[PDB]
Amino acid sequence: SDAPNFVLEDTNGKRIELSDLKGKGVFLNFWGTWAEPAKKEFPYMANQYKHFKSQGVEIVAVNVGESKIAVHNFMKSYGVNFPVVLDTDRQVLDAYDVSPLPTTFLINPEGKVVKVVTGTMTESMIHDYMNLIKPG
Numbered sequence: 657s658d659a660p661n662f663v664l665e666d667t668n669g670k671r672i673e674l675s676d677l678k679g680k681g682v683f684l685n686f687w688g689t690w691a692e693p694a695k696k697e698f699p700y701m702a703n704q705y706k707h708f709k710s711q712g713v714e715i716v717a718v719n720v721g722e723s724k725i726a727v728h729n730f731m732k733s734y735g736v737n738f739p740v741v742l743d744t745d746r747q748v749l750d751a752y753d754v755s756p757l758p759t760t761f762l763i764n765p766e767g768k769v770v771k772v773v774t775g776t777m778t779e780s781m782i783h784d785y786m787n788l789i790k791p792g
Contacts, residue, residue, distance in 0.1 A: 659684070660674075661673065661674045662747075664744075667727060667728060672716065677763075678766075688720040688722060693776055700782050711792065712790055712791040717738065718748055720749055721746040756774050
């Protein structure tokens, strides 16, 4: 089931289009700084990303319309090492029909959504999901 495309700037004004990431598996995570799960889970993700990045899985944590500073702070606080983008006026969110928050979409290399993950993730789970979508 096809994944709605989008273009947002990450947190250094750098333009990211979802369809550019064809070939790679995409851990598409929707989040806000208020969500207590993302405080638990971002360190897990940064940790698994050390492993999975060069296996061809990519993470795109789409923050849900918060200001640039709020995000940068949260990123620093939780040692983020992975691409975060800003959905400033919340359109991508609506495009994706999201809530709960967080919500993760697992997108395979062809670009279809293989699993919608909602609620809580163990690092253990995060790892499995990253397997579920990696190219090899």
